[PDB]
C-alpha cells in the first residue's frame with residue numbers, strides 16, 4: 008500500500 | 018466539561034475544519050447535465066477529495082501517530098466508506114443551496130449507480146439533516162468512526178479503544194450540554210452510525226458494478242478499497 012503510506016507520513 | 022476534554026474537542030474541531038471542500042466541482046454538476054462518463058469523472062474527483070481529507074484528518078488525530086503502522090493503514094481502509102458518507106451528508110446539509118436535492122438525485126442516477134443504492138444514500142442524508150447535526154458532531158462522529166476498534170486487520174484493538182473512548186465520552190456530554198431535555202440524542206447519533214455501516218456493502222457493489230461496465234478508477238482509489 009505504498010500510496011496511503013505516503014499520505015500518512017507526509 | 019473537562020480541561021483534557023476541551024483541548025481534545027478543540028484539536029479535533031480545528032483539524033476537521035481545516036479540511037477544505039472546494040465547491041466549484043459541485044457547482045459544476047449542479048448547473049450542467051453532463052454525459053454519464055463526464056459525471057463519473059466528476060465523481061472520481063470528489064471521491065479522491067474524500068480520501069485525501071480523510072487521511073489529512075486521520076494523521077492529526079491525537080495518538081494516531083503512536084499506533085503500530087499496519088493498524089494505521091487498517092483503520093484508514095476500514096473507515097473510508099463510513100467517513101466518506103458522513104462528510105457527504107455534511108455537504109448535502111450545509112454546503113448546497115436549498116431546493117436542489119432532486120436535481121442532484123437526477124445527476125446521481127445518471128452516473129451509473131443503481132437506484133437500489135441511491136435511495137438509501139439520500140434517505141441517510143435527510144435523516145442527518147433532520148437531526149440538525151452540529152459541526153462538533155460531524156467531527157466527533159468522523160473520528161469515532163475512524164478509530165473504530167472493531168475493524169478487520171487490527172492487531173491491537175485495546176490501543177484503539179483507548180483513543181476512541183474519550184471521544185465517545187465527550188460526544189455524550191455535549192449531547193447533554195446542548196440538549197439536556199432530549200436525553201436520547203446520543204442514542205440517535207449512534208443509530209446513524211449503524212445506518213452508516215450498511216454503506217460498506219453498497220459501496221463494494223457500486224464499485225463491482227462500475228467495473229463490469231468498463232469504468233476505470235485511479236490508483237489510490239484502488240488501494241484504499243483493494244480493487245486488484
Ligand SMILES: CC1(C)[C@H]2CC[C@]1(C)[C@H](OC(=O)c1ccc(O)cc1)C2
Pocket residue numbers: 057060061062063064101102105223233234235238
Ligand atoms: C455519492 C458518491 C458519488 C460520493 C460519495 C460516495 C460516492 C459514491 C462517490 O465515491 C466513489 O466511491 C467513487 C469511487 C471511484 C470513482 O472512480 C468515482 C467515485 C463520491
Ligand SMILES: CC1(C)[C@H]2CC[C@]1(C)[C@H](OC(=O)c1ccc(O)cc1)C2
Pocket residue numbers: 037038039040042043063064066067104105106108109113121125
Ligand atoms: C449529494 C452528493 C452526492 C453531491 C453533493 C453532496 C454529495 C455528497 C457529493 O458531494 C461530494 O462528495 C463532494 C466532496 C468534496 C467536494 O469538494 C465537493 C463535493 C456530490
